[PDB]
């Protein structure tokens, strides 16, 4: 049975219990909108709204902010998960939408929504590393992939954000 969850018991209004790993299967706070359109979001003129910064030289870091590239990323278990290789930007409302992380002790590169990063000392001083409180450095290996490296679809956005959202409940749990 591939079904992702089962009822805790037969009474009305009982919880469901995940069968497999809830972060991978997408159950509870790890779940995503599974019917979401698998296409890129577009600017008013129809270019891809969210792209790696190297693809649009219009964008640059505001002078006197740190560039986060090359910093280590520290996961919830204090392990070094990787290092920031690239920034992805929203071209409709200029901001950094995702860090792209080269995984430490692995081949793969993964996206990391900036809502889940924080600076040491909340950016005021130091700024020598990034903190990801929500998942362990092992779990960074299972972060969902984008089909291409120059664009991201709305479904891929939902999948990636849902992965880090579930971590605060499931990262330190044997439920895997």
């Amino acid at each position: 049975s591939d079904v992702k969850f089962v009822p805790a018991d037969n009474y009305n209004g009982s919880p469901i219990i995940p069968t497999g790993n809830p972060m991978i299967d997408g159950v509870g706070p790890a779940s995503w909108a599974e019917d979401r359109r698998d296409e890129p979001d577009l600017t008013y003129h129809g270019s891809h709204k969210i792209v790696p910064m190297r693809l649009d030289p219009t964008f640059s870091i505001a002078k006197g902010d740190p560039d986060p590239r090359g910093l280590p990323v520290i996961a919830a278990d204090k392990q070094v998960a990787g290092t920031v290789v690239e920034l992805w930007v929203n071209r409709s409302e200029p901001q950094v939408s995702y860090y792209e992380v080269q995984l430490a002790s692995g081949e793969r590169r993964v996206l990391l929504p900036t809502g889940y990063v924080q600076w040491p000392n909340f950016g005021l001083w130091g700024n020598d590393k990034l903190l990801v409180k929500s998942i362990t450095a092992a779990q960074f290996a299972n972060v969902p992939a984008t089909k291409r490296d120059d664009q991201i679809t709305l479904l891929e956005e939902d999948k990636i954000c849902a992965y880090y959202a579930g971590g605060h409940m499931y990262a330190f749990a044997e439920r895997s």
């Binding site: 909108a33 809502g115 954000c161 959202a165």
Partner: peptide, 21 residues
């Protein structure tokens, strides 16, 4: 839900994500 893109309300209206749900 802003860390899940909930503030992008026009996208959430036209293509409901988990933040809207």
């Amino acid at each position: 839900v802003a860390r899940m893109g909930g503030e992008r309300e026009i996208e959430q209206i036209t293509d409901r994500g988990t933040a809207a749900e």
